[PDB]
Amino acid sequence: ITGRPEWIWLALGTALMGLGTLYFLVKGMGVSDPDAKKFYAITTLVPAIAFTMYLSMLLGYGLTMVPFGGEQNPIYWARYADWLFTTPLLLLDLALLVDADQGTILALVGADGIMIGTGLVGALTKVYSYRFVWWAISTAAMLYILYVLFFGFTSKAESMRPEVASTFKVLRNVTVVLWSAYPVVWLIGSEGAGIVPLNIETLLFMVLDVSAKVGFGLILLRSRAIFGEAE
Amino acid sequence: ITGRPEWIWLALGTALMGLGTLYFLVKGMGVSDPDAKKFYAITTLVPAIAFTMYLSMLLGYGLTMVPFGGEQNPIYWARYADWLFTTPLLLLDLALLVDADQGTILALVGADGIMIGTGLVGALTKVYSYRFVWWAISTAAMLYILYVLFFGFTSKAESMRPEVASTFKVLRNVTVVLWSAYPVVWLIGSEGAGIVPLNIETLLFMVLDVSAKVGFGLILLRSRAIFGEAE
Amino acid sequence: ITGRPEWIWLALGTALMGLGTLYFLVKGMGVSDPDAKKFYAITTLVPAIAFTMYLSMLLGYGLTMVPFGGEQNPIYWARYADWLFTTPLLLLDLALLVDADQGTILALVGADGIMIGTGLVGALTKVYSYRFVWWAISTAAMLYILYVLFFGFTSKAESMRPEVASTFKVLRNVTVVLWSAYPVVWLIGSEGAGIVPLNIETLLFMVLDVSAKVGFGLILLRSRAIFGEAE
Numbered sequence: 001i002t003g004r005p006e007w008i009w010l011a012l013g014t015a016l017m018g019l020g021t022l023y024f025l026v027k028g029m030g031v032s033d034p035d036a037k038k039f040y041a042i043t044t045l046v047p048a049i050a051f052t053m054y055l056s057m058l059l060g061y062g063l064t065m066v067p068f069g070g071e072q073n074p075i076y077w078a079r080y081a082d083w084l085f086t087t088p089l090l091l092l093d094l095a096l097l098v099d100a101d102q103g104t105i106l107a108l109v110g111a112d113g114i115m116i117g118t119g120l121v122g123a124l125t126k127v128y129s130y131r132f133v134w135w136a137i138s139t140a141a142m143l144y145i146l147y148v149l150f151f152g153f154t155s156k157a158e159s160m161r162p163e164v165a166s167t168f169k170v171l172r173n174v175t176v177v178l179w180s181a182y183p184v185v186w187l188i189g190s191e192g193a194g195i196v197p198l199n200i201e202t203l204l205f206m207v208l209d210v211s212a213k214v215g216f217g218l219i220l221l222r223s224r225a226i227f228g229e230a231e
Numbered sequence: 232i233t234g235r236p237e238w239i240w241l242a243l244g245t246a247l248m249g250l251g252t253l254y255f256l257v258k259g260m261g262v263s264d265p266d267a268k269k270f271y272a273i274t275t276l277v278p279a280i281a282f283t284m285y286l287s288m289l290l291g292y293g294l295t296m297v298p299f300g301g302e303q304n305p306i307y308w309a310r311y312a313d314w315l316f317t318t319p320l321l322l323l324d325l326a327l328l329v330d331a332d333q334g335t336i337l338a339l340v341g342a343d344g345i346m347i348g349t350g351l352v353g354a355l356t357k358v359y360s361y362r363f364v365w366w367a368i369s370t371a372a373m374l375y376i377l378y379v380l381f382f383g384f385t386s387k388a389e390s391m392r393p394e395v396a397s398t399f400k401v402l403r404n405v406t407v408v409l410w411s412a413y414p415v416v417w418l419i420g421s422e423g424a425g426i427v428p429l430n431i432e433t434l435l436f437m438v439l440d441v442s443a444k445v446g447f448g449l450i451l452l453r454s455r456a457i458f459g460e461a462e
Numbered sequence: 463i464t465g466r467p468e469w470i471w472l473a474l475g476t477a478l479m480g481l482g483t484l485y486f487l488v489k490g491m492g493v494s495d496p497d498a499k500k501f502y503a504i505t506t507l508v509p510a511i512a513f514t515m516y517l518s519m520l521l522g523y524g525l526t527m528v529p530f531g532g533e534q535n536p537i538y539w540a541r542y543a544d545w546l547f548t549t550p551l552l553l554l555d556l557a558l559l560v561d562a563d564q565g566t567i568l569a570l571v572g573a574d575g576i577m578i579g580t581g582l583v584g585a586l587t588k589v590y591s592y593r594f595v596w597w598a599i600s601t602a603a604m605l606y607i608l609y610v611l612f613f614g615f616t617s618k619a620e621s622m623r624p625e626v627a628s629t630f631k632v633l634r635n636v637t638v639v640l641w642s643a644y645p646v647v648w649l650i651g652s653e654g655a656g657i658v659p660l661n662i663e664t665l666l667f668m669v670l671d672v673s674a675k676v677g678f679g680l681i682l683l684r685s686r687a688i689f690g691e692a693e
């Protein structure tokens with residue numbers, strides 16, 4: 001484990017995702033509202049999945065070597081197995097908050113799968129220049145997601161209860177800022193141009209992951225928007 | 232790229248799926264009917280997924296070598312990753328058109344997963360004679376799907392609006408004819424008996440894919456069956 | 463095939479899953495109740511999936527070698543591909559029986575995915591002591607599932623029709639007893655401590671699989687709880 005300088009950030013990430021999972025699990029014990037139960041189930045699964053994948057990276061299972069640039073490059077593939085399941089769950093939290101229609105939910109989840117799937121292909125591609133073709137396709141899929149979150153959901157939240165509109169607006173802004181950083185870290189990190197070393201890259205993804213999952217969840221599950229209007 | 236004679240058909244397929252995706256995306260911009268939005272989302276995702284997998288084959292990522300018959304045989308595995316997601320989406324288009332019940336939808340999607348999954352196992356199997364055992368199981372799963380589309384959905388469409396009944400009947404006939412060709416191309420192509428060479432096999436799958444996805448989508452999204460009855 | 467002593471139990475399992483699939487398929491022909499169709503579709507898919515994965519193990523495709531303990535250990539990875547899809551389908555049978563809320567269904571299916579996913583990682587892990595870390599995480603996920611089936615569903619079934627309450631109680635008890643045996647067989651078998659040899663381990667999993675899928679299905683599909691109350 002300790003033979004890799006980035007191990008400290010993988011261990012911290014593992015701990016923070018595990019602690020986040022347990023807090024949400026305990027906090028959700030005393031909840032019977034069927035609407036609130038939906039948000040607790042979605043939001044608790046997110047850091048639980050991330051916990052297992054951070055642990056796999058810490059123990060060395062989620063790491064492979066990819067030859068490109070005449071070098072064997074360490075690629076943590078477990079990140080994409082994490083994101084494949086956690087990013088659509090996070091979008092479902094937002095879509096259920098605004099009572100989005102089914103067709104829009106399917107478009108979001110499908111574009112998200114394309115985003116993560118093409119990012120994985122780009123991470124494992126051995127022809128250096130082709131890695132950035134996949135990065136560009138994946139980034140186009142992300143821009144579609146961000147467009148929908150702004151010019152489809154925002155207008156839908158305003159016609160909703162005030163507390164669900166204000167909570168959505170906050171979580172929307174958090175998501176757009178944090179998610180946009182991921183393609184940048186990829187491009188300048190060891191998967192892309194190799195400007196930033198792997199140990200610093202790992203620290204950046206850990207800060208982003210914890211903020212986008214645990215921080216996101218703390219804002220959502222403390223809001224009254226997750227409960228139905230009741231007397 | 233150009234070192235493979237089949238590259239021209241992979242490049243054409245990539246272009247036609249990309250163009251198809253963009254047309255459906257633009258055409259769906261001016262749509263607010265929640266029913267129509269469902270069909271546009273399903274139908275636009277189909278060629279978008281196929282685009283990415285054709286590109287992976289063009290660039291050489293979606294290709295592996297499988298030893299059988301005393302030879303290293305080029306097997307494009309990316310086809311099955313495509314079909315795993317696009318064939319159930321196409322069946323969902325048909326099932327939603329006739330307002331199929333949930334139990335029937337689950338049976339269709341499950342049989343479809345078995346069809347594609349066993350076809351993938353057959354494509355990667357190293358014992359030559361066993362490849363055709365998997366082909367037979369996969370073909371049995373397809374025949375179940377075709378039976379349901381005829382002796383379960385057809386009777387349901389007649390009790391529906393006339394425009395949804397006539398549109399379903401057309402898309403049903405297109406699907407049964409085109410899908411039935413796939414097991415035949417597999418059997419006589421490089422995955423099976425090896426009668427037809429890979430470059431011709433690739434041309435045939437490209438014609439079938441574009442027809443079953445883009446051609447299918449053009450018929451559906453030009454129909455009024457996708458809109459609810461409104462004044 | 464016959465070069466492996468466990469082949470006899472893989473062949474028996476294949477036959478019993480295939481026969482089970484055909485019986486459920488025939489029995490479900492004469493069913494039009496939309497509620498009953500749901501249970502028949504879920505319950506017939508379970509042994510059909512298991513059939514294909516037992517066949518892959520029989521023919522040698524679903525087997526790999528994992529080095530640990532200074533030895534190349536035969537690991538049947540196809541079991542986890544089976545369980546990944548069949549265990550959530552079995553939980554869906556139970557959840558639909560008691561009309562569970564959506565949030566609870568998602569929590570069950572998500573915990574089940576974590577259970578199977580971490581068990582697969584543990585089966586393929588090359589550092590011997592780490593294999594049991596994954597076993598423990600997977601077992602914690604199972605205990606969560608069992609808790610929900612007892613202290614969330616049981617109370618919900620009592621407020622239901624008497625026949626659905628008594629049928630659920632029976633299937634609940636069958637599930638908790640049979641599922642609990644799996645982590646024990648893993649721990650003492652070739653994936654874990656290696657006390658029980660592989661051929662005996664394979665026999666035990668076959669008895670458990672057939673009972674948990676075909677036996678489970680025979681109890682459910684003979685009950686009147688799967689039909690709506692009708693005159």
Ligand SMILES: CC(C)CCC[C@@H](C)CCC[C@@H](C)CCC[C@@H](C)CCOC[C@@H](CO)OCC[C@H](C)CCC[C@H](C)CCC[C@H](C)CCCC(C)C
Nearest residue numbers: 109110113114117118120121124280283295308311312316
């Ligand atoms: C509606 C939305 C959900 C739609 C989703 C969008 C999606 C279509 C976007 C594209 C996804 C696609 C790129 C997934 C590729 C997975 C692949 C990286 C797995 C590893 O295989 C890659 C190479 C080794 O580098 O295999 C070496 C050769 C091996 C012999 C490969 C044989 C196994 C194949 C991988 C079998 C295909 C399985 C499916 C891809 C499983 C789904 C994985 C997940 C990442 C989507």
Ligand SMILES: CC(C)CCC[C@@H](C)CCC[C@@H](C)CCC[C@@H](C)CCOC[C@@H](CO)OCC[C@H](C)CCC[C@H](C)CCC[C@H](C)CCCC(C)C
Nearest residue numbers: 340341344345348349351352355511514526539542543547
């Ligand atoms: C309700 C419906 C959706 C049900 C679906 C029906 C489905 C059950 C039908 C059978 C599907 C099954 C054959 C999928 C097999 C995937 C497999 C080809 C992936 C590549 O692995 C094959 C060998 C190399 O040749 O791995 C070499 C050895 C490696 C060490 C393998 C270890 C990884 C395992 C593959 C882990 C299992 C992952 C799941 C199979 C992922 C789903 C893939 C998709 C193709 C279903």
Ligand SMILES: CC(C)CCC[C@@H](C)CCC[C@@H](C)CCC[C@@H](C)CCOC[C@@H](CO)OCC[C@H](C)CCC[C@H](C)CCC[C@H](C)CCCC(C)C
Nearest residue numbers: 049052064077080081085571572575576579580582583586
């Ligand atoms: C809501 C719920 C459904 C959530 C589900 C819970 C889930 C997150 C729990 C953890 C699942 C995770 C451990 C799955 C790992 C699959 C992995 C074993 C496949 C084989 O790859 C392992 C190594 C060889 O040993 O690959 C060698 C290196 C290769 C180069 C690997 C590159 C391919 C990657 C495997 C791509 C990721 C694909 C996804 C993991 C596909 C889903 C598989 C299924 C088992 C979940």
Ligand SMILES: *C/C=C(C)/C=C/C=C(C)/C=C/C1=C(C)CCCC1(C)C
Nearest residue numbers: 119138139142179182183186209212
């Ligand atoms: C909890 C994890 C989250 C919210 C991860 C989000 C990840 C992304 C938005 C990743 C995007 C990428 C691109 C847009 C292209 C480059 C490759 C990716 C996958 C890093």
Ligand SMILES: *C/C=C(C)/C=C/C=C(C)/C=C/C1=C(C)CCCC1(C)C
Nearest residue numbers: 350369370373410413414417440443
């Ligand atoms: C857009 C792609 C489509 C509609 C693909 C359809 C593919 C099939 C219907 C494939 C069927 C197969 C068999 C029936 C057995 C032989 C292997 C397959 C997977 C080619």
Ligand SMILES: *C/C=C(C)/C=C/C=C(C)/C=C/C1=C(C)CCCC1(C)C
Nearest residue numbers: 581600601604641644645648671674
């Ligand atoms: C039809 C198959 C069924 C119902 C299989 C159930 C399997 C389990 C409940 C497996 C549980 C495991 C653990 C709890 C940890 C050890 C590894 C597993 C996956 C065997």
Ligand SMILES: CCCCCCCCCCCCCCC
Nearest residue numbers: 181182184185195196197200204
């Ligand atoms: C979206 C965030 C990207 C900003 C990356 C900042 C990295 C600064 C760290 C110093 C770079 C290390 C280079 C010298 C080793």
Ligand SMILES: CCCCCCCCCCCCCCC
Nearest residue numbers: 016019020023210211214215218
């Ligand atoms: C009462 C609110 C705080 C509860 C404690 C939460 C502990 C989980 C770890 C959170 C750290 C990361 C927060 C986002 C920066």
Ligand SMILES: CCCCCCCCCCCCCCC
Nearest residue numbers: 412413415416426427428431435
């Ligand atoms: C379902 C369509 C299958 C028909 C295949 C027709 C192939 C004819 C092309 C000529 C065969 C090439 C053999 C000589 C190289």
Ligand SMILES: CCCCCCCCCCCCCCC
Nearest residue numbers: 247250251254441442445446449
């Ligand atoms: C107005 C209808 C035609 C629009 C142009 C569609 C261009 C997408 C490519 C379609 C070619 C394949 C059609 C099926 C044979």
Ligand SMILES: CCCCCCCCCCCCCCC
Nearest residue numbers: 643644646647657658659662666
């Ligand atoms: C949950 C069931 C686990 C019980 C396992 C009993 C196995 C007894 C078979 C004899 C053990 C073989 C050891 C000598 C070869």
Ligand SMILES: CCCCCCCCCCCCCCC
Nearest residue numbers: 478481482485672673676677680
């Ligand atoms: C009339 C009920 C029996 C029908 C025959 C079922 C045959 C399928 C194989 C069942 C054997 C396994 C039963 C569970 C132990």
Ligand SMILES: CCCCCCCCCCCCCC
Nearest residue numbers: 315316319320323336340344
């Ligand atoms: C194995 C991959 C299957 C999933 C394909 C994605 C489409 C799923 C459609 C689900 C239809 C709704 C069923 C109720």
Ligand SMILES: CCCCCCCCCCCCCC
Nearest residue numbers: 546547550551554567571575
């Ligand atoms: C990782 C594979 C999980 C999918 C298994 C297929 C069954 C899914 C059941 C979904 C139940 C409906 C939830 C609302």
Ligand SMILES: CCCCCCCCCCCCC
Nearest residue numbers: 139143146147150180183184
């Ligand atoms: C185009 C939709 C408007 C909202 C999206 C904001 C774009 C942020 C740019 C992200 C940069 C990634 C490289």
Ligand SMILES: CCCCCCCCCCCCC
Nearest residue numbers: 370374377378381411414415
């Ligand atoms: C048996 C259901 C009737 C409709 C299915 C038509 C069968 C077409 C044969 C396809 C040939 C594939 C080898």
